[PDB]
Design a protein around this ligand. Structure first.
Ligand SMILES: [K+]
Ligand SMILES: [K+]
Ligand SMILES: [Mg+2]
Ligand SMILES: [Mg+2]
Ligand SMILES: [Mg+2]
Ligand SMILES: [Mg+2]
Ligand SMILES: [Mg+2]
Ligand SMILES: [Mg+2]
Ligand SMILES: [Mg+2]
Ligand SMILES: [Mg+2]
Ligand SMILES: [Mg+2]
Ligand code: NA
Ligand code: NA
Lengths: 143, 71, 102, 65, 182, 212, 136, 71, 152
RNA sequence: AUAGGAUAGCGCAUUCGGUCGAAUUCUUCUCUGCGGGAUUCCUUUGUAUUUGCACAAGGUGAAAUUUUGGGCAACAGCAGGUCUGUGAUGCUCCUCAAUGUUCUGGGCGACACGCGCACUACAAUGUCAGUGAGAACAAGAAAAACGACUCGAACCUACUUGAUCAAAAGAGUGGGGAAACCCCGGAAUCACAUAGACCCACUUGGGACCGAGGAUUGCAAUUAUUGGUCGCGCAACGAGGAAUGUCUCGUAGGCGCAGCUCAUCAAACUGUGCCGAUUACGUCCCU
């Protein structure tokens, strides 16, 4: 019938995760083509699972979500992926549901963790000359 | 610290004197008004002037202000 | 159908934008099909060197940067028409290259 | 281990400023001899108003300096 | 369908309260699934007191050069430690950890001669985590016991007030010295 | 192949830097004030800015054709592929390169440093500059070297805006005792025309438009 | 980790190629205690002898020790390639061989004496107790 | 210092079969320090007991194994 | 149950199961069938010169063949150099700092040749290696068997 | 499952960047020239308050105080450094068996030792062996010369062979002037319920020293140029006295990668991204 598709994104450091949310026959969420229960380590699996458990799986009833994450490392990608999933649910309800249930979902997401919907603005601080890093100066000797 | 420099304060006083009728207590409308009656290569200064201009407007409602004539 | 690509390259941002806008306006005057202009990624040539001529003092460095701005405009027009569009005075430091896409 | 509530922070005493001086209201039961008794104490570590302390000895009072 | 988070999907945060009245506002019992949160907890002065207590334990497990920045590793060590704590005590590991934190730091300290001062609740939580992690790290250095075993034994002994705990032994010595500096 | 764009830009910059150095040394006594080149398919057109355009050209353009021969032979330009033009600077007193050459010429003629430096400042400030700052250093009086600066009007030193509003140039003077350095800075008057002045308002100047 | 009861013939030290080999270790890491045999060579020796590397030394019988010594003495006989041996081309004899036990020390002393007799630079550096590679 | 055997004998293996069960907490390090055996042959054997379901596996990992007695 | 299909899901494909579990099941299948060609050099060579010791697993070549088979499934057109970046490690240089070194392309060349002999992979048109139709069927069928917990 | 836990799904089931398919539709992600956006803006039964200038918490918000990090940075100076950057330069020295210039060979690297910086470690928050998932800054080839007749080759890299048997190699076939090839840039810190080996020992820690083989760069490798292989490991080192360096958030620390020097060679520097804390958010005790 109608497609009923929504595309969102989430960011964490240099990682960019793009989630495509589609009405389908059954719920099916994959990150880079990998099912949720096949994501390792279990610590990062639980972090991505937070986008579903804090609102309940009832709102992901018939949603097929495909998340493509590029850039960053394993932890940064996991945070970008969970944010993309959470924003994908909110944008789907924004487009195909009324405001009361969308606001309820958004309030629950923000109550649990701010960065489920709002990207973390932190980035690597540039290195400066005369320093080994952003702030670590060269060792000074006197005698 | 957020001390307004004399350049910001002087421009704010000039704006208030010349365009008192066009200003109110809202920063955003005052910022829009100032961007039309001011030439300045810095948007940071114009934002600061708008902030101090609406501050002077609040003070003027609460009695007189030194440095403002409104003759 | 012949597709011709115009590549505008310079290290001055204002000059490359002025040339691109002039080419775009002239191309629309001859009502030819336009694809773009595409703002390709700008490359920064970076050279970092010591400030002192000798080796004395705190090891301070100068980071010199050169930015290159490139634009591509694809035209569906004959070579005679694309020559007419190109036929105008460009700013100094702007390189415009004409190539026929395969 | 009497529990006391910090009602105000007087200032950062000491040469290095690590120790801070606060006014502590004892959190005693109603009708207790220590009910609403306030003393001045020196506190190590980050402390804020409305924090709670575990006083080992309530007789000692910190110098006002 | 949303349910309360359980740490590693096994341990419940329901009814998790510290016995100490002074430390009630500085030990966080907020429910979480794993001790991993990319939060900016050091932005404000007392913001880290709202960080979940288990995550603060994990942050204390990545200390030396070989340990710095290994937070998934610390989470794995905590996952094993909580299982060992549960077996040792037949109790909720979260409650045992909270009890250990509530007793791992001295209530009174001596500072610069030296004179006795009281310790703020924030420092008490900070020192208890720091001392327990330090004691476990030194106990497991050149020992057959694994790190989860040493950390579990430290936390169990601290939760009971036992003198076998490194943190309690440090606490008793500091409070004794502070008493003599009154 | 065909060199990459990075290599082409580097090559064009190196060509300009060498061209500027050659003309700076060749036209030192003609008030050389700058050079710009425009490249087409037909030819490369180079425009030289100088104060004394008559001496840059010569009789029937003998000097300008000699300079063309120099550039053509060094850079292997073909016949008819290179052209030189000479244009005068509208205001000489607003050009730091022209004034620093004038100061060097006056110093080489045994003129006192105070006299020559103040003469430059008076000429520059008469030209409409917001400010002028010339400095002369090295063996001015005797064996010991000292630096003396002469300034008038406005001058901005910090930020990045002084790269646009301030025109600078430094030359070496070869005297009997040794080497003397002369540096001239001119605070260009912000003029709505871009020839002499950045045409932008000063970065920290705020103007309130008078109501109708 | 074998879950095997300790044999009645278990030896805490096994003598192999005039070397006291610790029987507490796994076979490949007990063979590396023989001079001339490393971790890589010992794994090859155990492979050619049919002994799995999960056994503990000291459980090796006399027959297994003899087979190990035969392989170490003449690795090329048991199809170990030449590129895997110590002396691929002896500078005096010209034959590819593998040195083990006291032969490593003896051949090293002969190499130093040979370089010293020529008065070559590397030999003279050895004579003065100095680093012979680049170093400083 | 410590002398941990790298192979079981009759006595240690029998103690492994009988007394290592009915331990509230079971770990190869704990068994190694009680039976005076190497941790490698303690981690093995504990696996054998778990295979025969004389003990239960509580927390499993690539490096860390935690067991407990069967109720 | 543990192996019951989740609602409307039926069958299985690669990337739907544990990568290691699929690789070990494929390696067991390769060893059990016995038709795969194993070079004699695998008994003495190391996987890469960046490694310090021998691969320490008697069936390491079968595991490597399964791993490269899965890698070719994921990225069609890969070559020996592309596979070398996958199986590289960090080399210990002693007192010098460590650096990343790609794996030796010898074993990767052997592994692809063994798979080509089995008919699972073929030289992709315009460079690289690719999975045959038989190879794709083999990977998916084994993925389903892993999900059913059949193994070998 | 060899013993197999926990972890979402319960009108249309998923997958295939070689399926080296074909067409419509688009900009969510990417690229970017000019803009917008944040300023003490709003609030306070706060502080301080004649006022004013302001401050502190909390809102709003991507961002809440010089947003964050840099660049620039006055006037006076220093007998600071550079005559080893220049066809910058005064005086002076040498100037035809030369202090000019070139060529050959040595040296700048020498080692009882002292000192500053860095790298690697002392191990089980580990070492090996395997497998998984996975970045960002960046670099890449040549002439008024050589061959053909404007083009080719130099530089980088992919694929394949070498390969019916080690690495490192060696060879072909393409591609790339660099958002086009490399490249879907498979970095390793990391992860693994891998049912893997080791088990507290100078030990499978450490990898310094040294021996033989072979390859490569170069006109030339001896004083090992640099990789690769097998040996040596029995060389100390089991956490380091007095003293002392740097650092407040994507920071310290840890981890690599690129550029740069470069025919060959990084424990250096200049950048880049990845994993990511403890503590304080105070004072004038020391400097
Ligand atoms: K001064
Ligand atoms: K070696
Ligand atoms: Mg200024
Ligand atoms: Mg400034
Ligand atoms: Mg790998
Ligand atoms: Mg190491
Ligand atoms: Mg090393
Ligand atoms: Mg390192
Ligand atoms: Mg030297
Ligand atoms: Mg080692
Ligand atoms: Mg250097
Ligand atoms: Na340990
Ligand atoms: Na001189």
């Amino acid at each position: 019938y109608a497609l009923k598709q929504v595309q969102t994104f989430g960011k964490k450091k240099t990682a960019i995760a793009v989630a495509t949310v589609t009405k389908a026959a059954q719920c099916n969420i994959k990150v880079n083509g990998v099912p949720l229960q096949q994501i390792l380590p279990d610590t990062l699996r639980a972090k991505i699972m937070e986008a579903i458990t804090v609102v309940g799986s009832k709102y992901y009833s018939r949603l097929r979500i495909d998340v493509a994450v590029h850039g960053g490392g394993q932890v940064s990608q996991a945070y970008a992926a969970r944010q993309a999933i959470a924003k994908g649910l909110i944008a789907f309800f924004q487009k195909y549901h009324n405001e009361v249930e969308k606001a309820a979902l958004k309030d629950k997401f923000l109550a649990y963790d701010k960065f489920l919907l709002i990207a973390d603005p932190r980035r690597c601080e540039p290195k400066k000359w005369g320093r080994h890093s952003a702030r670590t100066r060269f060792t000074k000797s006197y005698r | 610290g957020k001390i307004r420099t004399k350049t910001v304060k002087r421009a704010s006083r000039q704006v208030v004197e010349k365009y008192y009728s066009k200003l109110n207590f809202d920063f955003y409308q005052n910022k829009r008004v100032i961007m039309d009656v001011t030439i300045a290569e810095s948007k940071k200064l114009k934002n600061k002037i708008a902030g101090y201009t609406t501050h002077i407007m609040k003070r003027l409602a609460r009695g007189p202000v030194r440095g403002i004539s409104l003759k | 159908g012949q597709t011709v690509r115009l590549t505008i390259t310079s290290r001055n941002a204002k000059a490359v934008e002025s040339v691109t806008s002039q080419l775009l306006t002239r191309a629309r005057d001859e009502k030819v099909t336009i694809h773009g202009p595409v703002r390709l990624p700008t490359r920064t040539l970076k050279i970092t060197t010591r400030k002192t001529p000798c080796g004395n003092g705190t090891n301070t460095w100068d980071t010199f940067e050169l930015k290159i701005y490139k634009r591509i405009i694809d035209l569906h027009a004959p070579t005679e028409q694309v020559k007419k569009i190109t036929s105008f005075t460009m700013e100094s430091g702007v390189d415009v290259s004409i190539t026929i896409l395969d | 281990a009497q529990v006391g509530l910090i009602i105000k922070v007087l200032g950062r005493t000491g040469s290095r400023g690590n120790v801070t001086q606060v006014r502590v209201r004892l959190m005693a039961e109603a009708g207790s001899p220590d009910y609403n008794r306030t003393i001045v104490r020196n506190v190590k570590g980050p402390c804020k108003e409305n924090d709670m302390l575990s006083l080992m000895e309530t007789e000692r009072e910190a110098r006002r300096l | 369908s949303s349910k309360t988070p359980k740490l590693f999907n096994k341990w419940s945060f329901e009814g998790l309260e510290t016995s100490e009245l002074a430390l009630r506002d500085h030990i966080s019992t907020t429910a979480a699934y794993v001790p991993h949160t990319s939060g900016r907890w050091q932005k404000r002065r007392f913001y880290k007191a709202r960080m979940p207590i288990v995550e603060r334990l994990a942050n204390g497990l990545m200390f030396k050069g070989r340990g710095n920045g290994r937070k998934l590793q610390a989470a794995r060590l905590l996952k094993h430690t909580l299982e060992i704590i549960h077996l040792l005590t037949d109790e909720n590991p979260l409650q045992v950890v909270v009890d250990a934190v509530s007793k791992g730091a001295p209530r009174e300290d001596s500072t610069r001669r030296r004179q006795a001062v009281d310790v703020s609740p924030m420092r008490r939580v900070n020192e208890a985590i720091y001392q327990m992690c330090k004691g476990a790290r030194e106990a497991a250095f050149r020992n057959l016991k694994s790190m989860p075993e040493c950390l579990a034994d430290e936390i169990v002994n601290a939760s009971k007030g036992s003198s076998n705990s490194y943190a309690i032994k440090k606490k008793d010595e500091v409070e004794r010295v502070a008493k003599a500096n009154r | 192949g065909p060199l990459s764009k990075k290599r082409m830009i580097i090559r064009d910059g190196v060509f300009y830097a060498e061209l500027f150095e050659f003309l700076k040394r060749e036209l030192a006594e003609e008030g050389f004030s700058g050079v710009s080149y425009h490249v087409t398919t037909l030819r490369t057109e180079i425009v030289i800015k100088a104060t004394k355009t008559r001496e840059v050209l010569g009789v029937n353009g003998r000097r300008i054709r000699e300079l063309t021969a120099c550039i053509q032979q060094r850079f292997n330009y073909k016949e008819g592929k290179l052209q030189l033009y000479v244009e005068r600077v509208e205001v000489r007193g607003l050009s730091a390169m022209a004034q620093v050459e004038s100061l060097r010429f006056k110093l080489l003629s045994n003129l006192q440093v105070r006299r020559a430096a103040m003469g430059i400042i008076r000429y520059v400030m008469e030209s409409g500059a917001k400010g002028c700052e010339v400095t002369v250093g090295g063996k001015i009086k005797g064996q010991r070297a000292k630096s003396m600066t002469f300034r008038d009007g406005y001058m901005i030193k910090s930020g990045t805006a002084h790269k646009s509003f301030v025109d600078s140039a430094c030359r070496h003077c070869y005297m009997r005792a040794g080497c003397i350095g002369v540096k001239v800075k001119i605070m260009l008057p912000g003029d709505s025309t871009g020839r002499n002045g950045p045409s932008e308002p000063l970065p920290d100047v705020i103007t309130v438009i008078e109501p109708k | 980790m074998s879950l095997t009861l300790i044999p009645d013939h278990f030896q805490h030290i096994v003598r192999l190629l005039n070397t006291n080999v610790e029987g507490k270790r796994k076979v490949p890491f007990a063979l590396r205690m023989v001079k001339g045999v490393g971790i890589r060579f010992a794994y090859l020796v155990c492979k050619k002898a049919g002994i799995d590397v999960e056994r503990r030394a000291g459980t090796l019988t006399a027959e297994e020790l003899e087979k190990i010594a035969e392989i170490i003495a003449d690795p090329a006989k048991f199809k170990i390639p030449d590129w895997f041996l110590n002396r691929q081309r002896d500078p005096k004899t010209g034959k590819t061989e593998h040195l083990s036990s006291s032969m490593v020390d003896t051949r090293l002393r002969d190499d130093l004496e040979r370089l010293k007799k020529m008065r070559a630079h590397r030999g003279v550096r050895h004579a003065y107790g100095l680093r012979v590679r680049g170093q400083h | 210092a410590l002398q941990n055997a790298v192979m079981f004998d009759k006595e240690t293996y029998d103690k492994l079969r009988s007394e290592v069960p009915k331990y509230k907490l079971i770990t190869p390090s704990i068994i190694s320090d009680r039976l005076k055996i190497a941790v490698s042959i303690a981690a093995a054997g504990l696996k054998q007991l778990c295979r025969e379901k004389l003990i239960r596996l509580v927390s499993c990992s690539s490096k860390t194994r935690v067991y407990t007695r069967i109720v | 149950n543990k192996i019951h299909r989740i609602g409307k899901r039926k069958g299985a494909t690669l990337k739907d199961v544990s990568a290691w579990r699929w690789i070990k099941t494929a390696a067991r299948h390769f060893k059990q069938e016995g038709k795969i060609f194993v070079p004699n050099c695998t008994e003495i060579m190391k996987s890469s010169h960046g490694r310090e010791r021998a691969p320490q697993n008697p069936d390491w070549y079968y595991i490597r063949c399964a791993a490269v088979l899965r890698a070719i499934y994921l990225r069609p057109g890969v070559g020996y150099g592309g596979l070398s970046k996958r199986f590289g490690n960090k080399k210990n240089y002693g007192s010098r700092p460590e650096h990343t070194v790609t794996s030796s392309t010898g074993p990767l060349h052997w592994a692809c040749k063994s798979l080509t002999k089995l008919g699972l992979v073929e030289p992709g048109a315009q460079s690289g290696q690719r999975l045959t139709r038989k190879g794709h069927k083999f990977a998916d069928s084994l993925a389903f068997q892993v999900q059913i917990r059949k193994f070998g």
